């Protein structure tokens, strides 16, 4: 699954939840992968896509809303986009996911 890898990343790796943190990490070049929820607004989604193209950061389109993505991460609040600074113990980066 993809939820197990995300949960392992949150448990052991390094991550940023939210649009502002994701954009800041994209600017700083510390992002390895950005997971985008399907519920995010179109303008912010396009801005994130352009920033990822500029920073050459891999993009994964999550199959669910921001609340499903928040539950997958392990937080009881909605998250619209996640950025993976360090995979840590998990292998989400290796499997092209």
């Amino acid at each position: 699954s993809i939820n197990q890898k995300l949960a392992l990343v949150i448990k052991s790796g390094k991550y940023t939840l939210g649009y502002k943190s994701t954009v800041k990490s994209l600017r700083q070049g510390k992002s390895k992968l950005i997971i985008i929820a399907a519920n995010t607004p179109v303008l912010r989604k396009s801005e994130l896509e352009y920033y990822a193209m500029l920073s050459k950061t891999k993009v994964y389109y999550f199959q669910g809303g921001n609340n499903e993505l928040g539950t997958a991460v392990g937080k009881l609040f909605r998250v619209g986009v996640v950025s993976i600074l360090e995979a840590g113990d998990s292998d989400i980066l290796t499997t092209l996911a």
């Binding site: 992968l33 990822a52 050459k56 891999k58 993009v59 499997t95 092209l96 996911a97």
Partner: peptide, 12 residues
Amino acid sequence: AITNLISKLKGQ
């Protein structure tokens, strides 16, 4: 060098 940025699960 980049060719694709959208990623997908390999096992499906």
